[PDB]
Design a protein around this ligand. Structure first.
Ligand SMILES: [Cl-]
Ligand SMILES: [Cl-]
Ligand SMILES: [Cl-]
Lengths: 191, 191, 191, 191, 191, 191
């Protein structure tokens, strides 16, 4: 429709006007850390229990210990999002890849067709697995897991790839189903 | 192959045996309330923080406050899992639908082809929306959401449908990509 | 619709009230052999010529001579039905696999995602071929047939796999298109 | 490869030469009435019981009583075969449509893209329903059947459409999986 | 609709009545060379600049220098058209393959399912590449190009295969979207 | 692999260095008007006749007379390229949309998921029609065309939409099949 999209989603799900002090505080921290308050967080912020559960999982997967780099996990995110054609996540995580790699072209490549990127084999098979999980998880076999081991991932690493991949298969669906809008600031960042 | 499937997954992700006190307890409680310790929990239990993040989200979405019944969320779970052909989730959540509805055939119908179920339109459109997210969330439009509203769901309700559906799009992928095995007790229950 | 489904199909195709003596007799025999009269037979029973042709083919393929076991042919049936999401056939032939193997878990695995089953290679490639025939028969090549020979099937066996597979691609379509309902007794059998 | 395709299929399924008397006769009759012995029959003819079961079903569905014309059933056959890209069936049944309609272009249209054919709505919806069964029979709903009724088909008619369509979903798969070759005479007939 | 299709397309795009002398002249030449004026040309003939650009590209690709034979390029055309189910092009280029090969059966095979044709490997991998470009160009990799080189195509040849393939992915779409009708004369030619 | 991608494509198709005078000039003009020589042109430039045929068609469709704006045709280009996941075209034509609209986010939306764009219905239905051609042109019906007319497009306009859309279905395939690289300057422009 030729009307400016509602933010943070197309759902009437108020936050609402005086935020609870703890959520207000949290958002001050994001603003400081991030330069913004990501709209996915405003989306969950109508209920702090929900926001807490969302963020606890996001942080663990994206920022917690793993032998997958932060960038690597962001790369997975974008490839999943590209396959699901998730606008929110392509914008948000696209930015993250441009930031963490210092390579705007890599972000564009992953957003558009990851197969064109001149990646080392380790990163490429990581993304191929995520892709196959995204399109046809029921068809993943032991040989697919061995491909990952053949390029240096151990079983904990495979678990991490699977969870990051599965997580964006969740968040893409939620974002797209609710018409979740990415913060306008992302688009011009790290270009 | 022609070998007993490893449990809880085909990954070597030891727990290990002297469990942390808090995880031991969670499990004891599961056993006592559920008659078993669901295998998904043993898979995350190598890391209490990951287990914590998983369970908090699971419990909020499936058991936390909602205008969707517990049964309705499990129905969603089964329909998503059927489309993704997730053995773990079809077994565990199929069992849940059989349990909560006291109707073995309902479980079977949602496992196999939800369209045959003689549901009221409220529940049918809920499932149609989950199916559409699962297959093609990028194609969800305002009109799709208005369909839910036209059968009595409000926007908080739509949010809940969207999150339960995205969650099983994650957990199916994790389960399938890691060859996660459902507890054998499930198969013969609530028949 | 929230109305108990019509049996044996949603079509008004009466049998009708006094069955012809030969069909009545036949049904007495089924009841004895099977404990029930399968609803697919009631579906064809409005015309004995049609019932005769249906049953002649079913029997030859499923029960006639072959070096494929009875169970093996039932396994094919369920994998085809799973891919086509045929409720009738998944219920009827699912039961048959649970019965003939004495392994309820095997039936569930084939109904839900056959790839998880710890089968020997012979049975697994048999099912992979059926699957490929079901999704993309035009793409079957000589190398696909040689895979079967590489695991001990001769050309007569391949012919049998193809016909059993093709047959359920027929019966699934008829059942699903007519809203053919499986006999309630199947669901609880052989659990 | 660059070798003459084996007939009647790429399987070594000898007939063999001194045919059983009854099969000899059937074939003589075919030759006399059809100008040829269709290759599908030679493929089943290694086993008279299999041949018997095939022909009984073929003949009932395609030539037996129906309110669908013979041509209409062959049209169905061609549309199913086009979607499945079955060379044998497209050649043989394409020829049948050209023959029965006395309209070479009609055959070509149904082989290539049935949607371009300027059909009356009765025949178009019949074909749309066959196409939908062929692609996604699990998605057939009561509304789909009501469409057929709204163009003058009764429930016996729907049954017939469903069975002819399921039958070609079987025979396409058998033909394609075994590299069944249509008789070369077909190609130049009714042009 | 049961009304004779409009030619050359279903669009009201007049040529119009007195053709410009140069277009009239050109059409006299086609009629002489071809026995007809192909309807695709009448379609573009409302604007000679458009006709000029269309024909310049067609001629270069189909008739200009290449180490791909004329027939080979026509074979590509038909395989692309078959996958896109383009009636116009299947008829027009089907004829061309029957003509240039002097083998009606080869035309039918490519129209219906090219995989059945007993081609040498060079021609078969040429068509497999075109097919993969047609279904999933984003997935073409260096190894796919090396397959072509492994059967004697150099890089100029690969460029030609790609352009011929891409061109019919254009013309199929235009023809099908506008309901472009093939000249009736094609159907009976070269049988 | 982990090697700089070859430009302008991964094919060895030398231009070569002393360019023909007329191609030199074209390129000088591009540089002067565009700030660059688009890589697609260097790929065709090994053969002036091929380059001539490409550019004539490009220029007529994208820059020649139409009731579609230049921007509208580039929007079409981007939507087609997104569906085909064409990196070259998404970069180059994405940049064009950002340039002509003076709206960076519009480019991003059409690259990622055009459905989220708040377009007027005229432009949305234009894009829906392009998308449908791209995915399934054989399924375009008179009703699809009438939708365009109902938002003010005439039949010449529909023709133009159809040709621009088919053209990017060609150029995406060529680009992707040959690993054509977009000029690096594009990525950071009009942000
Ligand atoms: Cl129950
Ligand atoms: Cl004819
Ligand atoms: Cl801009």
């Amino acid at each position: 429709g030729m009307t400016k999209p509602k933010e943070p989603t197309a759902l009437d799900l108020p936050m609402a006007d005086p935020l609870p002090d703890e959520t207000q505080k949290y958002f001050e921290i994001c603003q400081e850390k991030l330069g913004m308050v990501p709209n996915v967080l405003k989306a969950y912020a109508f209920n702090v229990e929900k926001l807490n559960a969302f963020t606890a999982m996001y942080n663990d997967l994206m920022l917690g210990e793993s032998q997958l780099s932060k960038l690597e996990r962001e790369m997975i995110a974008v490839v999943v999002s590209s396959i699901n054609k998730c606008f929110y996540c392509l914008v948000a995580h696209g930015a993250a890849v441009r930031q963490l790699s210092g390579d705007p072209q890599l972000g564009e490549m992953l957003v558009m067709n990851y197969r064109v990127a001149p990646l080392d084999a380790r990163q490429r098979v990581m993304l191929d697995f995520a892709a196959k999980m995204t399109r046809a998880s029921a068809e993943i076999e032991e040989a697919d897991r061995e491909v990952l081991r053949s390029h240096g991932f151990n079983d904990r690493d495979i678990w991490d790839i699977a969870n990051v991949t599965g997580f964006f298969n969740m968040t893409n669906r939620v974002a797209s189903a609710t018409a979740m809008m990415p913060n306008a600031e992302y688009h011009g960042q790290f270009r």
